[PDB]
Amino acid sequence: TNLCPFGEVFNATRFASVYAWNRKRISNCVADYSVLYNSASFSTFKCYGVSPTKLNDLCFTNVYADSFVIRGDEVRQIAPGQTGKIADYNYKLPDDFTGCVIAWNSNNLDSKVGGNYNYLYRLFRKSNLKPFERDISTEIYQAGSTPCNGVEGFNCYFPLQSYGFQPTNGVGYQPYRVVVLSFELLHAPATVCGK
């Protein structure tokens, strides 16, 4: 009865941008992972630190489900030890990450004839994000010697750029919905067990 709400995470009507990635906390529910096995509609399925087969018979204190949208050329960056605009400025996974990364082509949903520009990504940042950090600040990036007092112009750019998602985009530039499941095991009662 108390099945973990993986449906409202994967089958969510609308997803968030990668800079403002949404996190769902999974606690106090039997974890039915059979929605990942049966659904062959997945393009990228890679796990780290844990194996998916030996996962339905293992308990965890908490499970975190992070979801966002990126393009195909950036899906490879959702992994430990990766660099790039997404890995460094939007969503970073630690080197000892223990979980699974799932993504599928969502060109049918996240594309408009005039270009879907609702999905954004951070372009500049003064430093790289720490693991599992969510930066949504829109401070004007200072790229030159002249300081920006919140105004844009010469070497003063807005930090967020919008994706260009069209139906005729190349596969590398088509939208992909990513779900990142992360598993933690602390010295605390384990509320999430598989079955």
Epitope: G114, G115, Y117, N118, L120, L123, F124, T138, I140, G150, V151, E152, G153, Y157, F158, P159, L160, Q161, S162
Partner: nanobody
Amino acid sequence: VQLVESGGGLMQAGGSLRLSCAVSGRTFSTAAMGWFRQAPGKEREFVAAIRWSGGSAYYADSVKGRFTISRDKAKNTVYLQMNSLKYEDTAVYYCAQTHYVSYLLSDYATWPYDYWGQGTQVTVS
């Protein structure tokens, strides 16, 4: 997603006029607004644009220093202050809305916007 202009009319040269533009519908999908004008014999030309977030503005060189663009996020309306009106300012002023977020503010001077308003007449005497 509707755009409604108001505030235009006849005005003496050197005077000041304030334009408005109401936005209704997907009001949280606004990335930047922009004012445009087009004389009958000439083509449409960019006037000014402002980013919804932060509020930074970008003006055309013909109106820089005289015109001022602003917006109220709660009311979702972009304003255009038009001080020191010249005879060359006579045109039909359209406001435009877009959901495209460009890191460079100057791109909104040449970017094709999503929705446009019916336009308001501005005549300088």
